Design a protein around this ligand. Structure first.
Ligand SMILES: CCN(CC)c1ccc2c(C)c(CCNC(=O)NCc3cccnc3)c(=O)oc2c1
Lengths: 215, 215
């Protein structure tokens, strides 16, 4: 029985080097190989290091593994830190009685550039109108930081019912996406001239407008 | 290197028994040790099984590993389900040439009644087309448990490139919502007879399709 101790969190700025340590509680670090895994929001982990210092193919050469016998530890060193490196990192070794994981280190990359959202408003599809539904969707993507406010309008008037906005989640570009959907009946959709989605990010507002088709 | 195929999700109420299968694509399951890792949401991984059926210290006997040579599969069975069992489970093996991980199974210990998603597929909006964008949105709402997998087809062929799926978030009705979007160019959109969004939830798969029209 041994455990692997790693910091719960570390922070660093783009282009700088960050190190994550993983201390083995009992026995020598060098007696068993160490793996490192990266995990991003909402996805399975990938392997970034195995056998202490080997990178699988696909893994940026900015990732380096090492062992320090005299602090009985393993380290993951990420140089030229990119925004995309923001993730959880787990160290892993073996007890022959077990596969042992460290507790995970959340790596925060500070000072990531602000990014205004792309907003696309979709009117109701034919299929859903045929099933007596007129849900509108406002796709909001590629924004940072991951907080927005969404308001809807029926013509010029504020919409007070039937809005849902998803919790922004980080996508592969390390920027956020959400959808806001307004669950109208067909009669509400066709009784108005238009509906608008209004997205405010970092005190900037984007408003899109859709209207019942001439079809 | 072979694949390990696991179901996307499983769910049961507390005190029930659930089994998670992991099928080896080629070679013999018994050629190589199968490990099972548990990852509770927001936690580090933990080994629950190694060497097909060995439980590490502290893993209760409610967890059982097995092999079926005839089906070339490994199974993890969890009896007397507890809420702390809610986790992703991954099987793992090797052929020396490399470590192979299964894709993970989400195990929900049911906290509320199951709810099949409403799935709505939106074709490109006029305004985004004028911006040379043919992004499609697949809106997925009112579902429980909060685990879905989304696959996109161009005609009949799977699409990988350009797919982003948001992490499911709990809406005002205590059910989950998510969206998947496929960043097409108008070129790609118009060059196919149709695009489909396939949503899998609890082993039911629904598929919506949209096709370029005009008016
Ligand atoms: C939770 C138990 N662990 C140990 C930390 C897991 C569990 C699973 C894996 C898998 C699947 C792979 C193989 C590569 N990973 C992978 O493809 N993950 C999904 C993904 C896909 C594309 C981009 N980012 C993530 C992998 O390399 O490592 C894994 C580690």
């Amino acid at each position: 029985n041994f455990m692997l101790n790693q910091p719960h969190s570390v922070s660093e700025s783009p282009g700088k080097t960050v190190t994550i340590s993983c201390t083995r509680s009992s026995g020598n670090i060098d007696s068993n190989y160490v793996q490192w895994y990266q995990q991003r929001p909402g996805s399975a982990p990938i392997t970034v290091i195995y056998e202490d210092n080997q990178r699988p193919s696909g893994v940026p050469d900015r990732f380096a593994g090492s062992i320090d016998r005299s602090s009985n530890s393993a380290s993951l060193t990420i140089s030229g830190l990119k925004t995309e490196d923001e993730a959880d990192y787990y160290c892993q070794s073996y007890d022959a009685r077990n596969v042992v994981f460290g507790g995970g280190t959340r790596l925060t990359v500070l000072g990531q550039p602000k990014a205004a959202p792309s907003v696309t408003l979709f009117p109701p599809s034919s299929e859903e109108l045929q099933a007596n539904k007129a849900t509108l969707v406002c796709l909001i993507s590629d924004f940072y930081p991951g907080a927005v406010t969404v308001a809807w309008k029926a013509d010029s008037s504020p919409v007070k019912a039937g809005v849902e906005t998803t919790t922004p989640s980080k996508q592969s570009n390390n920027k956020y996406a959400a959808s806001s959907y307004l669950s109208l009946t067909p009669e509400q959709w066709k009784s108005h001239k238009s509906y608008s989605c209004q997205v405010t990010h970092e005190g900037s507002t984007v408003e899109k407008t859709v209207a019942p088709t001439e079809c």
